[PDB]
């Protein structure tokens with residue numbers, strides 16, 4: 001299962017093409033990839049290197065609450081968005097009225113209030129826009145055979161107001177034999193840094209929704225647009241490519257939860273996570 | 286290349302699971318599939334059975350014009366949408382105010398006026414909403430390395446107003462070595478009927494955009510959500526699965542076109558299309 005992520009890494013280093021990008025760093029890029037990770041009695045948290053599990057759980061709870069306040073996530077110890085919410089970055093993009101830590105209409109806002117008019121990170125939008133997350137849960141409970149259980153974060157209207165446009169832009173759920181599956185379309189994949197994080201994030205979301213809807217976790221299908229390896233990540237990924245993968249850990253939910261909003265960080269427990277040492281990979285800014 | 290579509294058919298018949306759907310017909314379904322079709326000096330128009338090429342070209346020009354009037358497409362000889370625009374069908378879904386042939390805010394409206402308020406099929410929306418198709422062309426000309434060249438038709442706000450929600454919901458373009466590639470995310474794929482049509486449609490759109498932007502056609506990446514074979518299509522697809530694929534035809538554009546709106550149906554010419562006989566496959570309504 002983890003061999004699919006490693007096979008994608010090996011393919012990019014061997015068959016990828018050099019390609020410049022929004023940053024000064026270069027990449028080896030491949031367009032159009034797909035991998036399938038089993039969620040059955042296992043959780044795909046990569047073992048060939050340590051994955052920031054605390055950031056995965058806290059950011060998803062941050063998404064579900066509909067928050068767009070990077071400082072609210074930074075207070076829980078996760079600073080993965082602080083760079084895109086810094087005063088000097090909001091000023092550069094012309095957001096001279098947003099307080100520091102206001103990312104704009106991002107994942108949390110699109111999942112819960114699609115179409116609503118965005119004010120600021122402190123506003124309450126309850127009852128405004130389309131609650132895609134709850135409608136997805138409702139359609140699973142009442143019509144599992146529905147082929148439209150889709151949550152989309154790509155809003156061309158709200159794109160200019162975002163610090164960073166969504167990378168995981170669209171996801172779709174699927175039910176058969178009481179198994180809940182999820183496919184994610186990711187337009188841009190940092191194979192060294194973001195991709196292992198995003199895999200754990202959407203596998204966690206499937207476990208949450210399967211717990212609420214009474215289903216068993218099935219598969220996670222990771223579909224990529226621009227799958228790229230930054231040049232400064234080639235050697236860190238060559239080290240990881242020599243490590244033998246270990247069995248995936250397991251995820252246990254500690255209490256019966258009724259609504260998706262009732263989940264707390266203490267409700268989750270990772271078991272048997274024995275990863276290889278952390279491999280440093282700088283973030284391209 | 287055509288063996289990838291046939292390999293997907295073989296996999297669904299062998300490994301698919303029974304699954305009911307919106308219609309009374311059943312399906313054999315598989316969640317999460319991907320195929321890559323080369324657009325280099327060839328056009329992926331299936332040869333193991335005849336594909337309605339006249340409908341592919343006319344429907345795409347109908348999409349590009351932003352039209353939502355099924356009667357305007359039916360007048361060109363293509364009646365693929367008349368079922369979803371019939372007076373007796375609009376009334377069934379409660380659309381007791383639209384004149385016959387008004388599909389609502391569908392592909393053509395979303396490509397050209399995303400976010401605009403939908404009135405009726407006869408309105409002129411020039412200058413309203415987001416023109417996703419033209420910005421995709423602009424970004425390709427000025428910044429080919431951009432990882433955000435996305436056209437999305439999934440609008441949760443406009444979903445209840447559509448006769449049929451988009452199946453080809455999101456597509457992304459990609460440029461490298463002066464080759465234009467396109468990946469389509471299709472939430473629901475009728476493997477017998479729609480999928481061969483959709484492949485030719487988005488391969489045609491890539492040829493159109495590559496012609497305008499001065500690039501060469503690269504690859505088409507077809508990504509599927511619910512890839513299903515209807516029960517009444519199992520035996521027709523077994524016949525097709527025994528036919529030896531023939532070389533793909535070629536597509537030649539007859540005149541230099543400047544804008545995407547200037548394309549006419551007579552500007553295109555299919556050469557060397559020698560398909561196997563048509564195989565009848567009823568449409569599930």
Ligand SMILES: COc1ccc(CC(=O)O)c(NC(=O)c2ccc(Cc3c[nH]c4nc(N)[nH]c(=O)c34)cc2)c1
Pocket residue numbers: 050051052055079080190193194195197278283284285
């Ligand atoms: C493994 O141990 C740790 C320990 C601590 C941290 C927190 C920290 O990073 O300080 C991390 N971090 C992450 O897990 C991380 C960082 C960035 C994302 C997404 C993301 C935003 N913006 C981007 N820009 C580029 N180029 N690439 C990207 O990937 C992203 C996703 C995950 C890892």
Ligand SMILES: COc1ccc(CC(=O)O)c(NC(=O)c2ccc(Cc3c[nH]c4nc(N)[nH]c(=O)c34)cc2)c1
Pocket residue numbers: 335336337340364365475478479480482563568569570
């Ligand atoms: C000899 O080949 C021919 C000749 C003539 C025709 C025109 C005609 O159909 O009269 C056709 N038709 C199509 O190529 C066709 C029909 C429907 C679509 C999409 C579509 C809408 N709604 C759906 N519902 C279900 N279940 N499945 C689907 O696939 C769709 C895509 C293509 C094929």
Ligand SMILES: O=c1ccn([C@H]2C[C@H](O)[C@@H](COP(=O)(O)O)O2)c(=O)[nH]1
Pocket residue numbers: 022164165167168188189190191193194195198432433
């Ligand atoms: O969840 C995320 C967020 C970001 N990125 C990476 C992909 C790119 O390397 C970079 C975003 O840059 P663009 O594609 O927007 O230019 O961040 C991810 O992989 N996953």
Ligand SMILES: O=c1ccn([C@H]2C[C@H](O)[C@@H](COP(=O)(O)O)O2)c(=O)[nH]1
Pocket residue numbers: 147148306307449450452453473474475476478479480483
């Ligand atoms: O461009 C299109 C339009 C429709 N369909 C098929 C897929 C499904 O069989 C049906 C739509 O039904 P829902 O998935 O909305 O239930 O039409 C396609 O394959 N391609």
